[PDB]
Amino acid sequence: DLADRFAELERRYDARLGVYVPATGTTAAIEYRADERFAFCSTFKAPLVAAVLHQNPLTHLDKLITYTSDDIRSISPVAQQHVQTGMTIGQLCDAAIRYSDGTAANLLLADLGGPGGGTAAFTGYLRSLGDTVSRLDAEEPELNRDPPGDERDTTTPHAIALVLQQLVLGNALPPDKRALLTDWMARNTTGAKRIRAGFPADWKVIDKTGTGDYGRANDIAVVWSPTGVPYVVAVMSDRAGGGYDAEPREALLAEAATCVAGVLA
Amino acid sequence: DLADRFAELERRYDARLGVYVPATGTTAAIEYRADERFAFCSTFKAPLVAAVLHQNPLTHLDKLITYTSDDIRSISPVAQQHVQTGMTIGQLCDAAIRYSDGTAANLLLADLGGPGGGTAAFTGYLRSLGDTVSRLDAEEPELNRDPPGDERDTTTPHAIALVLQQLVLGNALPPDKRALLTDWMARNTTGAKRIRAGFPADWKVIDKTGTGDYGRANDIAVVWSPTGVPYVVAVMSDRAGGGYDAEPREALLAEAATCVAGVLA
Amino acid sequence: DLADRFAELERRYDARLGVYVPATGTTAAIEYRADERFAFCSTFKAPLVAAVLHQNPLTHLDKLITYTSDDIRSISPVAQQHVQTGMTIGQLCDAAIRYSDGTAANLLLADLGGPGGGTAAFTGYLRSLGDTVSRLDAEEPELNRDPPGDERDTTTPHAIALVLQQLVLGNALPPDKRALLTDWMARNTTGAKRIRAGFPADWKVIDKTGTGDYGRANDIAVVWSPTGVPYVVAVMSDRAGGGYDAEPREALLAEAATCVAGVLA
Amino acid sequence: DLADRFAELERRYDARLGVYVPATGTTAAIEYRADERFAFCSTFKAPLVAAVLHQNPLTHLDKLITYTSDDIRSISPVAQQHVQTGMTIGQLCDAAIRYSDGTAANLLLADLGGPGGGTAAFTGYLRSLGDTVSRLDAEEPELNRDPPGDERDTTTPHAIALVLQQLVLGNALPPDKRALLTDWMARNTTGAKRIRAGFPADWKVIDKTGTGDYGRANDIAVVWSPTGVPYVVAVMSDRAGGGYDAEPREALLAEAATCVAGVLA
């Protein structure tokens, strides 16, 4: 009965929507286009910070990285502000999650090293976590604007929901590094009108958004019931039909989240 | 099926739940124990105010009313403070909507004249909105204490929703008088943890709570979707098994309002 | 010289304003009517929680205190919702500060015991702290409506600033108990349009507010420079000449609060 | 008095501070080093846009301007992504106000035509507004690195302040184009930590920042007191001496904006 509401919304917004909420115990797993590929956009920055955390001792966050004006090829609300002072790996993590800093993402990719600017190294991480589907091919800003139907720079709601579940709810990171990943997502500044807006205020919400061309708008999140149960909520959308220049519609994602919330209550 | 949910919430919370959302042009009506009598408790204070308004000119609102300390018989956070100065009728209106002032409701009843200190004149008024079910027989605070089974001082979620919908959305009052009600109901102080706690914050909510013995908790409220679509939501509950001292479980009404929000999104 | 802006502010709000900011290491005190008595109103609730915290082990915060609907003689946003279940001392503390709950403060005074329904014990605690001017005589709601000119239930901005400094910034409490009072003040709901509104958001502001008749309106707070210097700011006002029904003007306090920030920076 | 506060802030942050608020009817103007030259930096992009606006018709905003990868020489997070799409003038206007787009600056200058790649055109327009002092001479990013003492590419707080007042507050643009300026300015991303960070949140703030070398940081802004009254605040600063790569200190600009808020409150 919930796959009809989602469908009514797809036509309401001239958009395509994908949803996956992994199953807990006392509740069943919500899915809708759950295995249809959607473009990562900036949502990849959450496991990207998880990857960098994984591969290094905490003392590595204090390492200072330096960059030029030419490294700024995308919206960078923080990296634009320290071109000559540079920033430590730790701030790049802060920026990449809390401000969706495109440049910070691109440096953290580099910290991972390897071919393809670190993208292949990153897709390695997801595989390690059990994710046999996602793939990262470009850096910012290209990874937002692959053509519709192109499998490059894509994930599924099913697969991204489970990478998130392991990172914050599971054991992919040791607790000290996990709390860093969590607190960042919790102090995010970019998802106030998405899954955050579809849930009551006494539900805690930590999230990481993603936005790109072709009307793409995503929001992956972990939410906490007012009694303290956690649920993982992956919502994803595009409007590829209306062209590269199609505005995204955040309301669709907030409205989705409200259908989902009434189910988890 | 949304009715399996309300029976879940009943089991999880050890209660009897009652839900009625009038059908709008764009949605079908919600029903769960819709035409079962629940106790009014303090929810009658909303139709009470619109009664004094309906019979009297706006100038009536300045009739200062005086009272003794023996007239204070229920929770009356406001009446208690003016027991030597008195309160105008329009204060007793503020008093009784926003603080659920028991005593002020008793005065407001007396102001409607008639036998049983105005309860006859009041049920009388309800019937002019087409409501032949509900009745008010007691005063404050006895109406809160009727045994289960007993039909005195009872309404139903169907009955109360439609009355409310006439008074806030409909022409049951002219605009000048109508905005005094909606304003008090909007700046109410007693309902933060009920219907309000279960709709996301981009929804506007105005409510009047009621609470009494045998676990009685209610909230009648008019909500507004983030795009301005008004709905009407009547939620009532009692736990007439757990005893006369059974505690009311607000979470139940809040968990139920989230179910409704799922359907209206 | 900051005495000129204040006196200008007295004139266009038709109010009388008291202001005190104790002198920190590098900066000189700010005073203006700093020793003219002003009514406590509800600001006394914060050192009252201090007094209860002081005389009892932490486990005393679990004592269940039980009250009746007769005990509700004043605005009590939380105490009015737990008349049947009762409330613990730590619940009362939370209400007394974060919601200025009136009934909550009365039971806490009763926990202090002693003559005067506890007003004696509270006034003595203040002496212990160094305060030889303030005095609590009545309970709530009487303490809000002593007539102008009446020393009863009055403190001074001077005296209240030095009490608040010792509780928050000194050793008048031990760390475990002190960090409880701060958090309650840091998480207040009544203070958003006063000293909080007059300080840039990058400053941290914890406060307790007071409001009574004759346009009385105070706010007592500790603030933190965005580099972390702490300052104490006692601001108190009334409009007692306008009469018992004079409205308080919150913007006077925000604006006085902005005058002071300009000087702490 | 305030004059002494700004030289305090100068001593502590190790800069020379420049401050000018035009006098309004109600206030007397603030001046600190007000007619001393500081470097435009990015703040010229405010009058730059209004120049395109003034001279061309609205349709001109839809002229697409194509550019090469060689034309990217400054921090250009928006121009970096459209090297194939090109950008309309309206877009290069957005980029240059809200993201301080270096490479969209130049393009708009080249739209002003004439000699020096439109630097001669630009001052030209400045003089048509009364401003006899400021000159623009280079482009991005040369104009950000002129040595101290050099008069090229410089303005003064008194200078820039009155042009900004003409543009946002005055009649240097017909209201239809007057709104596109202020709108872009209101939704600016590059200046959260400067003047905005020094005025309370019930003050509305619009601004165009500038940054460069020798610790140069500026912020020109139009602020609105909570009652509705508008002021113009020009805040500039450098730290020549401490070196060419001497890091700029946003804190200073935020500090000084809090003293301004002190006087105007």
Numbering used by the authors:
A (entry chain D), B (entry chain A), C (entry chain B), D (entry chain C): 29 to 293
From the paper:
Beta(β)-lactamases are bacterial enzymes that provide multi-drug resistance to β-lactam antibiotics. Mtb β-lactamase (BlaC) is a broad-spectrum Ambler class A3 β-lactamase capable of hydrolyzing all classes of β-lactam antibiotics used for the treatment of tuberculosis. Sulbactam (SUB), clavulanate and tazobactam, all β-lactam based suicide inhibitors, irreversibly bind to β-lactamases and block their activity. Here, we report in atomic detail (between 2.2 and 2.7 Å resolution) by room-temperature, time-resolved crystallography with millisecond time-resolution (with timepoints between 3 ms and 700 ms) how the Mycobacterium tuberculosis enzyme BlaC is inhibited by sulbactam (SUB).
At 3, 6, and 15 ms, the DED features near the active site of subunit A are weak. Substantial displacements of the residues flanking the active site are observed. Particularly, the long-side chain residues such as Gln112B and Arg173 (called guardian residues) move outward from the active site before relaxing back to their original positions. Next to these residues at 3 ms, almost 10 Å away from Ser70, there are positive densities that are spatially more spread out than that of water. An SUB molecule can be placed in the electron density. However, refinement of the SUB is difficult. Nevertheless, contrary to expectations based on the size of the SUB, no electron density is present at the earliest time points. This can be explained by the smaller second-order binding coefficient, kncov (1.5 mM−1 s−1 for SUB compared to 3.2 mM−1 s−1 for CEF), which prevents the accumulation of electron density at earlier times.
